[PDB]
Protein backbone atom coordinates (compact mmCIF):
# COMPACT_ATOMS: atom_id res chain seq x y z
CA UNK A 1 0.00 0.00 0.00
CA UNK A 2 1.19 3.52 -0.93
CA UNK A 3 0.48 4.85 2.59
CA UNK A 4 2.26 1.95 4.35
CA UNK A 5 5.30 2.52 2.08
CA UNK A 6 5.51 6.26 2.83
CA UNK A 7 5.35 5.65 6.58
CA UNK A 8 7.97 2.90 6.53
CA UNK A 9 10.21 5.22 4.48
CA UNK A 10 9.45 8.04 6.95
CA UNK A 11 10.82 5.86 9.79
CA UNK A 12 14.02 5.10 7.77
CA UNK A 13 15.00 8.56 6.50
CA UNK A 14 16.53 11.54 8.26
CA UNK A 15 14.14 14.39 9.08
CA UNK A 16 13.82 17.63 7.15
CA UNK A 17 14.80 19.05 3.80
CA UNK A 18 18.08 17.85 2.26
CA UNK A 19 18.39 21.12 0.24
CA UNK A 20 19.56 22.75 3.47
CA UNK A 21 22.39 20.20 3.69
CA UNK A 22 23.63 19.90 0.08
CA UNK A 23 24.57 22.44 -2.58
CA UNK A 24 26.21 22.70 -6.06
CA UNK A 25 23.76 20.27 -7.71
CA UNK A 26 24.60 18.90 -11.15
CA UNK A 27 22.72 16.15 -13.03
CA UNK A 28 25.06 13.33 -14.09
CA UNK A 29 22.45 10.72 -15.07
CA UNK A 30 18.71 10.04 -15.41
CA UNK A 31 16.64 6.91 -16.06
CA UNK A 32 14.30 4.24 -14.67
CA UNK A 33 16.01 4.39 -11.23
CA UNK A 34 15.50 8.18 -11.06
CA UNK A 35 17.86 11.14 -11.51
CA UNK A 36 21.40 11.28 -10.11
CA UNK A 37 23.24 14.47 -9.23
CA UNK A 38 26.64 15.29 -7.90
CA UNK A 39 26.40 17.69 -4.97
CA UNK A 40 28.52 19.10 -2.17
CA UNK A 41 27.87 18.31 1.47
CA UNK A 42 27.59 21.84 2.91
CA UNK A 43 29.20 20.83 6.24
CA UNK A 44 32.16 18.58 5.36
CA UNK A 45 32.79 19.54 1.72
CA UNK A 46 32.47 15.87 0.70
CA UNK A 47 31.29 15.46 -2.89
CA UNK A 48 28.25 13.17 -2.94
CA UNK A 49 25.99 11.41 -5.41
CA UNK A 50 22.31 11.96 -4.78
CA UNK A 51 19.69 9.70 -6.33
CA UNK A 52 16.32 11.49 -6.51
CA UNK A 53 13.04 9.57 -6.89
CA UNK A 54 9.40 10.55 -7.31
CA UNK A 55 7.57 7.70 -5.56
CA UNK A 56 4.44 8.23 -7.71
CA UNK A 57 6.46 6.83 -10.65
CA UNK A 58 8.17 3.89 -8.95
CA UNK A 59 6.36 0.59 -9.70
CA UNK A 60 8.20 -1.55 -7.12
CA UNK A 61 8.63 0.57 -3.97
CA UNK A 62 9.17 -2.56 -1.84
CA UNK A 63 12.52 -2.91 -3.61
CA UNK A 64 13.80 0.58 -2.71
CA UNK A 65 12.98 0.08 0.98
CA UNK A 66 14.87 -3.24 0.78
CA UNK A 67 17.67 -1.49 -1.11
CA UNK A 68 18.26 1.12 1.63
CA UNK A 69 17.87 -1.34 4.53
CA UNK A 70 20.43 -3.74 3.01
CA UNK A 71 22.89 -0.89 2.36
CA UNK A 72 22.41 0.48 5.88
CA UNK A 73 23.22 -2.82 7.57
CA UNK A 74 25.90 -4.18 5.20
CA UNK A 75 28.62 -1.54 5.12
CA UNK A 76 31.96 -2.64 3.59
CA UNK A 77 35.15 -1.01 2.12
CA UNK A 78 34.30 -2.59 -1.26
CA UNK A 79 30.66 -1.45 -1.24
CA UNK A 80 29.83 2.15 -2.29
CA UNK A 81 28.98 3.93 0.97
CA UNK A 82 25.34 4.75 1.69
CA UNK A 83 25.33 8.08 3.53
CA UNK A 84 21.78 9.25 4.22
CA UNK A 85 18.22 9.38 2.91
CA UNK A 86 15.45 12.02 2.97
CA UNK A 87 11.75 12.08 2.14
CA UNK A 88 9.95 15.31 1.23
CA UNK A 89 6.35 14.58 0.30
CA UNK A 90 6.58 12.08 -2.57
CA UNK A 91 10.24 12.92 -3.19
CA UNK A 92 12.76 10.33 -1.92
CA UNK A 93 16.47 11.18 -1.85
CA UNK A 94 19.24 8.60 -1.42
CA UNK A 95 22.69 10.07 -0.68
CA UNK A 96 25.76 8.01 -1.65
CA UNK A 97 29.49 8.63 -1.70
CA UNK A 98 30.54 9.88 -5.14
CA UNK A 99 33.25 7.99 -7.01
CA UNK A 100 34.79 10.34 -9.53
CA UNK A 101 36.51 7.56 -11.56
CA UNK A 102 33.37 6.35 -13.36
CA UNK A 103 32.45 2.67 -13.79
CA UNK A 104 34.36 -0.48 -14.74
CA UNK A 105 32.29 -0.43 -17.96
CA UNK A 106 34.08 2.77 -19.02
CA UNK A 107 37.45 1.12 -18.34
CA UNK A 108 36.73 -2.12 -20.25
CA UNK A 109 35.15 -0.30 -23.25
CA UNK A 110 37.84 2.40 -23.56
CA UNK A 111 41.09 0.77 -22.36
CA UNK A 112 43.00 -2.52 -22.30
CA UNK A 113 43.65 -3.90 -18.82
CA UNK A 114 46.60 -6.17 -18.11
CA UNK A 115 46.33 -9.34 -15.99
CA UNK A 116 47.78 -7.57 -12.93
CA UNK A 117 45.08 -4.90 -13.17
CA UNK A 118 42.36 -7.53 -13.75
CA UNK A 119 43.52 -9.58 -10.73
CA UNK A 120 43.31 -6.43 -8.55
CA UNK A 121 39.73 -5.68 -9.66
CA UNK A 122 38.62 -9.35 -9.27
CA UNK A 123 40.16 -9.45 -5.77
CA UNK A 124 38.32 -6.28 -4.67
CA UNK A 125 35.00 -7.53 -6.10
CA UNK A 126 35.45 -10.94 -4.40
CA UNK A 127 36.09 -9.13 -1.10
CA UNK A 128 32.68 -7.45 -1.49
CA UNK A 129 31.04 -10.77 -2.45
CA UNK A 130 32.58 -12.78 0.42
CA UNK A 131 31.23 -10.19 2.87
CA UNK A 132 27.74 -10.13 1.29
CA UNK A 133 27.48 -13.91 1.00
CA UNK A 134 28.67 -14.40 4.60
CA UNK A 135 25.88 -12.04 5.63
CA UNK A 136 23.32 -13.99 3.59
CA UNK A 137 22.99 -11.36 0.83
CA UNK A 138 23.10 -12.31 -2.87
CA UNK A 139 23.66 -9.27 -5.11
CA UNK A 140 22.16 -10.89 -8.26
CA UNK A 141 23.19 -8.12 -10.69
CA UNK A 142 27.02 -8.26 -10.76
CA UNK A 143 28.25 -6.53 -13.97
CA UNK A 144 30.84 -3.85 -14.79
CA UNK A 145 28.16 -1.11 -14.66
CA UNK A 146 27.71 -1.77 -10.95
CA UNK A 147 31.41 -1.54 -10.17
CA UNK A 148 32.36 2.06 -9.46
CA UNK A 149 35.90 3.35 -9.43
CA UNK A 150 37.71 5.92 -7.32
CA UNK A 151 40.30 8.25 -8.83
CA UNK A 152 42.80 6.43 -6.55
CA UNK A 153 41.78 3.07 -8.05
CA UNK A 154 39.30 2.12 -5.31
CA UNK A 155 36.91 -0.57 -6.54
CA UNK A 156 33.39 -0.52 -5.05
CA UNK A 157 30.22 -2.47 -5.74
CA UNK A 158 26.78 -0.87 -5.77
CA UNK A 159 23.08 -1.17 -6.74
CA UNK A 160 21.17 -3.25 -4.24
CA UNK A 161 17.97 -2.85 -6.29
CA UNK A 162 18.04 -6.59 -7.17
CA UNK A 163 19.54 -8.29 -4.11
CA UNK A 164 18.14 -11.25 -2.19
CA UNK A 165 18.38 -11.92 1.52
CA UNK A 166 18.48 -15.66 2.19
CA UNK A 167 18.21 -17.88 5.29
CA UNK A 168 18.96 -21.53 6.15
CA UNK A 169 15.17 -22.13 5.85
CA UNK A 170 15.21 -20.63 2.34
CA UNK A 171 18.80 -20.74 1.09
CA UNK A 172 17.86 -20.58 -2.60
CA UNK A 173 15.98 -18.24 -4.95
CA UNK A 174 14.19 -18.51 -8.31
CA UNK A 175 13.39 -14.96 -9.48
CA UNK A 176 15.12 -13.91 -12.67
CA UNK A 177 16.17 -10.38 -11.76
CA UNK A 178 19.71 -10.04 -13.15
CA UNK A 179 20.96 -8.61 -16.43
CA UNK A 180 20.68 -11.48 -18.99
CA UNK A 181 24.27 -11.51 -20.35
CA UNK A 182 25.79 -11.92 -16.85
CA UNK A 183 23.24 -14.53 -15.69
CA UNK A 184 24.35 -17.98 -14.49
CA UNK A 185 22.84 -20.85 -16.51
CA UNK A 186 21.08 -22.34 -13.45
CA UNK A 187 18.97 -19.16 -13.15
CA UNK A 188 17.24 -20.28 -16.37
CA UNK A 189 17.62 -24.10 -16.30
CA UNK A 190 16.26 -24.68 -12.76
CA UNK A 191 14.21 -22.81 -10.16
CA UNK A 192 16.82 -22.91 -7.38
CA UNK A 193 20.02 -20.87 -7.30
CA UNK A 194 22.24 -19.52 -4.50
CA UNK A 195 25.17 -17.11 -3.90
CA UNK A 196 27.39 -18.63 -6.63
CA UNK A 197 25.35 -16.87 -9.32
CA UNK A 198 27.36 -13.75 -8.29
CA UNK A 199 30.56 -15.74 -8.84
CA UNK A 200 29.45 -16.71 -12.35
CA UNK A 201 28.62 -13.03 -13.01
CA UNK A 202 32.10 -12.04 -11.80
CA UNK A 203 33.55 -14.54 -14.29
CA UNK A 204 31.56 -12.78 -17.04
CA UNK A 205 32.92 -9.45 -15.77
CA UNK A 206 36.44 -10.90 -16.12
CA UNK A 207 35.58 -11.75 -19.74
CA UNK A 208 34.54 -8.06 -20.07
CA UNK A 209 37.97 -7.06 -18.78
CA UNK A 210 39.67 -9.40 -21.32
CA UNK A 211 37.48 -8.90 -24.46
CA UNK A 212 35.57 -5.67 -23.80
CA UNK A 213 32.08 -7.24 -23.72
CA UNK A 214 30.18 -10.13 -22.12
CA UNK A 215 29.54 -13.08 -24.44
CA UNK A 216 26.46 -12.66 -26.71
CA UNK A 217 26.18 -8.89 -26.12
CA UNK A 218 25.17 -8.33 -29.76
CA UNK A 219 22.36 -10.90 -29.48
CA UNK A 220 18.79 -10.18 -28.41
CA UNK A 221 18.57 -10.66 -24.60
CA UNK A 222 15.97 -13.41 -25.15
CA UNK A 223 18.41 -15.33 -27.36
CA UNK A 224 21.39 -14.75 -25.02
CA UNK A 225 19.69 -16.58 -22.14
CA UNK A 226 18.94 -19.57 -24.38
CA UNK A 227 22.59 -19.35 -25.51
CA UNK A 228 23.87 -19.33 -21.89
CA UNK A 229 21.81 -22.40 -20.88
CA UNK A 230 22.80 -24.38 -23.98
CA UNK A 231 26.45 -23.34 -24.49
CA UNK A 232 27.24 -23.47 -20.77
CA UNK A 233 30.74 -22.21 -20.00
CA UNK A 234 31.47 -19.46 -22.58
CA UNK A 235 34.50 -19.75 -24.84
CA UNK A 236 37.20 -17.07 -24.98
CA UNK A 237 38.19 -15.71 -28.40
CA UNK A 238 41.93 -16.00 -27.67
CA UNK A 239 42.44 -18.27 -24.60
CA UNK A 240 46.11 -18.72 -25.54
CA UNK A 241 46.86 -15.07 -24.74
CA UNK A 242 46.02 -15.69 -21.08
CA UNK A 243 48.33 -17.05 -18.38
CA UNK A 244 47.61 -20.60 -17.15
CA UNK A 245 46.72 -19.26 -13.66
CA UNK A 246 44.20 -16.73 -15.07
CA UNK A 247 42.62 -19.50 -17.22
CA UNK A 248 42.30 -21.65 -14.08
CA UNK A 249 40.66 -18.76 -12.17
CA UNK A 250 38.15 -18.15 -14.98
CA UNK A 251 37.27 -21.85 -15.15
CA UNK A 252 36.59 -21.89 -11.40
CA UNK A 253 34.26 -18.85 -11.78
CA UNK A 254 32.46 -20.21 -14.85
CA UNK A 255 32.01 -23.80 -13.72
CA UNK A 256 28.67 -25.31 -14.81
CA UNK A 257 28.48 -27.56 -11.77
CA UNK A 258 27.48 -25.17 -8.94
CA UNK A 259 29.11 -27.47 -6.34
CA UNK A 260 32.38 -27.32 -8.28
CA UNK A 261 32.17 -23.54 -8.94
CA UNK A 262 34.34 -21.56 -6.52
CA UNK A 263 32.81 -19.74 -3.58
CA UNK A 264 33.91 -16.15 -2.89
CA UNK A 265 35.84 -17.36 0.18
CA UNK A 266 37.71 -20.03 -1.82
CA UNK A 267 38.45 -17.74 -4.74
CA UNK A 268 40.05 -15.09 -2.47
CA UNK A 269 42.75 -17.76 -1.91
CA UNK A 270 43.36 -18.33 -5.64
CA UNK A 271 46.89 -17.69 -6.88
CA UNK A 272 45.68 -15.56 -9.82
CA UNK A 273 44.85 -12.84 -7.24
CA UNK A 274 48.48 -12.87 -6.05
CA UNK A 275 49.67 -11.31 -9.34
CA UNK A 276 47.52 -8.25 -8.53
CA UNK A 277 49.15 -4.91 -9.13
CA UNK A 278 48.61 -2.11 -6.62
CA UNK A 279 45.18 -0.52 -7.15
CA UNK A 280 47.06 2.70 -8.05
CA UNK A 281 47.93 0.88 -11.32
CA UNK A 282 44.32 1.42 -12.45
CA UNK A 283 44.54 5.23 -12.24
CA UNK A 284 45.85 5.79 -15.81
CA UNK A 285 43.05 3.59 -17.30
CA UNK A 286 40.47 5.41 -15.17
CA UNK A 287 41.79 8.81 -16.33
CA UNK A 288 41.92 7.64 -19.98
CA UNK A 289 38.34 6.21 -19.91
CA UNK A 290 37.12 9.37 -18.14
CA UNK A 291 38.56 11.59 -20.89
CA UNK A 292 37.19 9.26 -23.60
CA UNK A 293 33.64 9.37 -22.21
CA UNK A 294 33.79 13.21 -21.90
Swiss-Prot record:
Residues 22-273 form the Protein kinase domain. Overexpressed in gastric cancer cells and tissues (at protein level). Its cofactor is Mg(2+). The gene is PAK1. Its main location: cytoplasm. Changing residue 175 to A: Decreases CDC42-stimulated activity and autophosphorylation. Its EC number is 2.7.11.1. The chain holds residues 249 to 542 of 545 of the full protein. The keyword Acetylation applies. The keyword Phosphoprotein applies. Activated by binding small G proteins. Binding of GTP-bound CDC42 or RAC1 to the autoregulatory region releases monomers from the autoinhibited dimer, and enables activation by phosphorylation of Thr-175. It catalyses: L-seryl-[protein] + ATP = O-phospho-L-seryl-[protein] + ADP + H(+); L-threonyl-[protein] + ATP = O-phospho-L-threonyl-[protein] + ADP + H(+). Homodimer; homodimerization results in autoinhibition. Active as monomer. Interacts with GIT1. Component of cytoplasmic complexes, which also contains PXN, ARHGEF7 and GIT1. Interacts with NISCH. Interacts with DVL1; mediates the formation of a DVL1, MUSK and PAK1 ternary complex involved in AChR clustering. Binds to the caspase-cleaved p110 isoform of CDC2L1 and CDC2L2, p110C, but not the full-length proteins. Interacts with ARHGEF7. Interacts tightly with GTP-bound but not GDP-bound CDC42/P21 and RAC1. Interacts with SCRIB. Interacts with PDPK1. Interacts (via kinase domain) with RAF1. Autophosphorylated in trans, meaning that in a dimer, one kinase molecule phosphorylates the other one. Activated by autophosphorylation at Thr-175 in response to a conformation change, triggered by interaction with GTP-bound CDC42 or RAC1. Activated by phosphorylation at Thr-175 by BRSK2 and by PDPK1. Phosphorylated by JAK2 in response to PRL; this increases PAK1 kinase activity. The modification Phosphotyrosine is found at residue 37. Belongs to the protein kinase superfamily. STE Ser/Thr protein kinase family. STE20 subfamily. This is Serine/threonine-protein kinase PAK 1. The modification Phosphothreonine is found at residue 175. One of its GO terms (molecular function) is protein kinase activity. One of its GO terms (biological process) is positive regulation of cell population proliferation. It is linked to Intellectual developmental disorder with macrocephaly, seizures, and speech delay: An autosomal dominant neurodevelopmental disorder characterized by impaired intellectual development, poor speech, postnatal macrocephaly, and seizures. ATP binds at residues 28-36, 51, 97-99. It comes from Homo sapiens (Human). It is found in: Cytoplasm; Cell junction, Focal adhesion; Cell projection, Lamellipodium; Cell membrane. The active site is at residue 141.
